[PDB]
C-alpha cells in the first residue's frame, strides 16, 4: 500500500515549508544592489607589442650570444644562385630517360 496518514501529513507540511523556502529564494527586481562603479586594441596589445618585445629580445640579447638561435642552413640545389658568394651552382647531368 501507500503511505500512512502521519507520513502524508508530514510530507504535506514539509512540502509547504519547502515551497515557501524555494519561493523565498526568488530575488527582488532591485537585487542585486550593486555598489556604485579601441576596436582593434586586441591586435595591438596582444600581437604588435609582444612582437616588438620579443624581436628586441631576440635581436639584441639572444642573437648577440653564440649558438642561441642556430638556424639550419638552406637546402642547396643544382641550379641555385648564391647571394653571398655569387657563384651559380652547376646543374645535373642529362638524364638516362625512362619515358
Amino acid at each position: 500500500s501507500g503511505y500512512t496518514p502521519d507520513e502524508k501529513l508530514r510530507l504535506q507540511q514539509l512540502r509547504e515549508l519547502r515551497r515557501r523556502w524555494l519561493k523565498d529564494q526568488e530575488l527582488s527586481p532591485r537585487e542585486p544592489v550593486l555598489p556604485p562603479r579601441r576596436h582593434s586594441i586586441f591586435a595591438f596589445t596582444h600581437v604588435l607589442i609582444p612582437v616588438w618585445i620579443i624581436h628586441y629580445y631576440l635581436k639584441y640579447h639572444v642573437t648577440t650570444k653564440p649558438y642561441t638561435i642556430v638556424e639550419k642552413k638552406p637546402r642547396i640545389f643544382p641550379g641555385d644562385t648564391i647571394l653571398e658568394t655569387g657563384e651559380v651552382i652547376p646543374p645535373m647531368k642529362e638524364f638516362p630517360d625512362q619515358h
Binding site: 586586441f42 591586435a43 596582444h46 600581437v47 609582444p50 612582437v51 620579443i54 624581436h55 629580445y57 631576440l58 635581436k59 639572444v62 642573437t63 649558438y67 642561441t68 638561435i69 642556430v70 638556424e71 639550419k72 638552406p74 637546402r75
Partner: protein
C-alpha cells in the same frame, strides 16, 4: 631569421597572456571565454606564418634563449626546437583547441566556474606546446607532467562526484607508471650520453640503446594508453566533454606517440624497439577496438576509438615509418575532436544522455550533427579522399610491404575492420532507427558557437588531409608498387567490416532473445582487464 623565431615565441607568450589576465583581476569579466577564444584564434594565425615559411623552404631552427642551469656538464637552457614536428603539430593543436573552446562557450555555458575551466584548458594548451616544442628532456618532462596534472584537474572537474576523482587518480597512477620509464630514459641519456638535448642524443648515435627505448615505450604506454596501461582513457570520459574532446582525443593522448616519433633516429637503428612497438601497438589496436564493439556509452566508444587509433600509430612507428604516424596524428586530431563534439551535442540535446540505447531518430532531428558525425565516421574508417585516407590507408600500404611481424599485420587488419564495425554501430544506434529518448524534445543546435565550431573542424575533416599531405616535403620514399590484392587490402576489409556489422545491426530488429555468451560478456566488461587489476593490485 628575424620573423620565424619571433612569431614562434609570440604564439607561446600570447597563450600565456590570459593566464596573467585571469590572475590580475578584481572585477567580473566581460566574457573571458570569448577573450581566450579570440586569443587562441590569434595564436593560430600567428603560428601559421612559420608553418608557411617551413612549407616554402624547410627552415628548421632552435631558440636556446635562456640559459637556466649549468650542472657541471649539463647546460639546461630554455631551448625550443622548430622542426617539421613542431611546425605541423602546433597549428593543428591550436585549430582544434580554438574549435573546442568555441564549442565550450556553449557546452559549459551554465557553469559558474567557467573562468576556472577556460584557465585550466589554456594551461593544458600551454603545457602541451611546452611538450611539443621541447628540445631537452627536462623541458619535455615539464610539458609531460603538465599535461598529466591538467589531466588530473580536468578529469576531476565536477569534484563532488566520487567517480570523477577516482578516474583522475587512476589517470595519474597510469601516467606515473609511464613516468617511471621516462625518468629511466632521462637517466640513461644523462649517464651514457651526458645530455638531455636532442641534438647530442641524435649525434652521438647509441648502439646499445635497448634500455632507453624500453623506457620511452613504457612512457608512451602510460601516456598514449597502449596495452597494459590503457584503462585510464576509458575511465577519463568522466570529465566534461570538451576535456575528453581536446585532451583525450587529439592533444594529450598523442604525446607518447609524439615522444616515439621525436626519437625516430634511435628507433630506426634498433630492430628490437621496432618489434616491441609493433607487437604492443597491434595488441592495443586489437583489444581496444574490440572492447568498443560492445559498449553503449558513446564517450566510451569514442575513447576506445581514439585508443585504437593510437595503437595503429604505435604500429606505424614499429614499421619504421615515423612521418606517416605523425601525419596520422595531425589527421586524426580534426575528425576525432569533431566526433567528440558531435557526441557532446547529442548528449546536451538529450539532457545529459550518453547511452546510445536511448538515442535514435536524430537523422533529421539534428541534421548538422548528423552530417558532421557521418563525415567524421567516414573519415575514421578510411573513406577514400577524406582526411583519414591520406594517412591511415598509407599505413596499411607500408604495413603490408615490409619485413614485418605477420601476426601484427593481421591484427592491424582485424582492427581496421573493427573500426568500421563500431563506426556503423555509432551511426545505427545514435542517428538511425527510432527515438528511444524521453518525451519532452528539447533538441536544439541553433547556436552560432556550435555551428561555427563544428563547421571549422568539418572544413578540416574535408580538406586538411589533402592540404597537409601535399604541403609536406618527402622525408621517406613511399611504397607505390604492390600487387592489386595488397593495394586494395584496407578498403576491402573496411567494407567487409561495414557489411558484417550491418548484419549485426539488422539482427537487433529480430524478435528473438539470446543469452549472451563469453564473447559479449568478455568484451562488454572491458576485456576483464580493469576488473582484476583495480581490485587485486591495490589490495596487495
Amino acid at each position: 631569421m628575424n620573423l620565424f623565431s619571433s612569431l614562434t615565441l609570440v604564439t607561446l607568450i600570447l597563450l600565456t597572456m590570459p593566464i596573467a589576465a585571469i590572475n590580475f583581476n578584481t572585477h567580473k569579466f566581460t566574457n573571458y571565454p570569448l577573450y581566450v577564444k579570440t586569443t587562441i584564434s590569434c595564436a593560430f594565425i600567428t603560428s601559421m606564418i612559420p608553418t608557411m615559411m617551413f612549407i616554402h623552404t624547410g627552415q628548421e631552427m632552435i631558440i636556446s634563449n635562456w640559459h637556466w642551469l649549468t650542472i657541471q656538464t649539463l647546460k639546461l637552457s630554455l631551448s625550443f626546437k622548430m622542426d617539421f614536428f613542431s611546425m605541423m603539430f602546433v597549428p593543428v593543436a591550436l585549430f582544434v583547441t580554438w574549435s573546442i573552446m568555441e564549442f565550450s562557450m556553449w557546452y559549459m555555458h551554465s557553469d559558474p566556474n567557467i573562468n576556472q575551466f577556460f584557465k585550466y584548458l589554456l594551461l593544458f594548451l600551454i603545457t602541451m606546446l611546452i611538450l611539443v616544442t621541447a628540445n631537452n628532456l627536462f623541458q619535455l618532462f615539464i610539458g609531460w607532467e603538465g599535461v598529466g596534472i591538467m589531466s588530473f584537474l580536468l578529469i576531476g572537474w565536477w569534484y563532488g562526484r566520487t567517480d570523477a576523482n577516482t578516474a583522475a587518480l587512476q589517470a595519474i597512477l597510469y601516467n606515473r607508471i609511464g613516468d617511471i620509464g621516462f625518468i629511466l630514459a632521462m637517466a640513461w641519456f644523462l649517464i651514457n650520453l651526458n645530455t638531455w638535448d636532442l641534438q647530442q642524443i641524435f649525434m652521438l648515435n647509441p648502439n646499445d640503446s635497448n634500455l632507453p627505448l624500453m623506457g620511452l615505450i613504457l612512457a608512451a604506454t602510460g601516456k598514449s594508453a597502449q596495452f597494459g596501461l590503457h584503462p585510464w582513457l576509458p575511465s577519463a570520459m568522466e570529465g566534461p566533454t570538451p576535456v575528453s574532446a581536446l585532451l583525450h582525443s587529439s592533444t594529450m593522448v598523442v604525446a607518447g606517440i609524439f615522444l616515439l616519433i621525436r626519437f625516430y633516429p634511435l628507433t630506426e637503428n634498433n630492430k628490437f624497439g621496432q618489434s616491441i612497438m609493433l607487437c604492443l601497438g597491434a595488441m592495443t589496436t586489437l583489444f581496444t577496438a574490440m572492447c568498443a564493439l560492445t559498449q553503449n556509452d558513446i564517450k566510451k566508444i569514442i575513447a576506445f576509438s581514439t585508443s585504437s587509433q593510437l595503437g595503429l600509430m604505435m604500429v606505424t612507428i614499429g614499421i619504421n615509418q615515423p612521418h606517416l604516424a605523425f601525419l596520422h596524428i595531425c589527421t586524426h586530431a580534426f575528425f576525432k575532436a569533431m566526433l567528440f563534439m558531435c557526441s557532446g551535442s547529442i548528449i546536451h540535446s538529450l539532457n545529459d544522455e550518453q547511452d546510445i540505447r536511448k538515442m535514435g531518430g536524430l537523422f533529421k532531428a539534428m541534421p548538422f550533427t548528423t552530417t558532421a558525425l557521418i563525415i567524421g565516421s567516414l573519415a575514421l574508417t578510411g573513406m577514400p579522399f577524406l582526411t583519414g585516407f591520406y594517412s591511415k590507408d598509407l599505413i596499411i600500404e607500408s604495413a603490408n610491404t615490409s619485413y614485418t611481424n605477420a601476426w601484427a599485420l593481421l591484427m592491424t587488419l582485424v582492427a581496421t575492420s573493427f573500426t568500421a564495425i563500431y563506426s556503423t554501430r555509432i551511426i545505427f544506434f545514435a542517428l538511425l532507427g527510432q527515438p528511444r529518448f524521453p518525451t519532452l524534445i528539447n533538441i536544439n543546435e541553433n547556436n552560432p558557437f556550435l555551428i561555427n565550431s563544428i563547421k571549422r573542424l568539418l572544413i578540416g575533416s574535408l580538406f586538411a588531409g589533402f592540404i597537409i599531405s601535399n604541403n609536406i616535403p618527402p622525408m621517406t620514399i613511399p611504397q607505390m608498387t604492390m600487387p592489386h590484392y595488397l593495394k586494395m587490402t584496407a578498403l576491402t576489409v573496411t567494407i567487409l567490416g561495414f557489411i558484417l556489422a550491418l548484419e549485426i545491426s539488422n539482427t537487433t530488429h529480430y524478435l528473438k532473445f539470446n543469452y549472451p555468451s563469453n564473447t559479449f560478456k568478455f568484451s562488454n566488461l572491458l576485456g576483464y582487464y580493469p576488473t582484476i587489476m583495480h581490485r587485486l593490485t591495490p589490495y596487495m
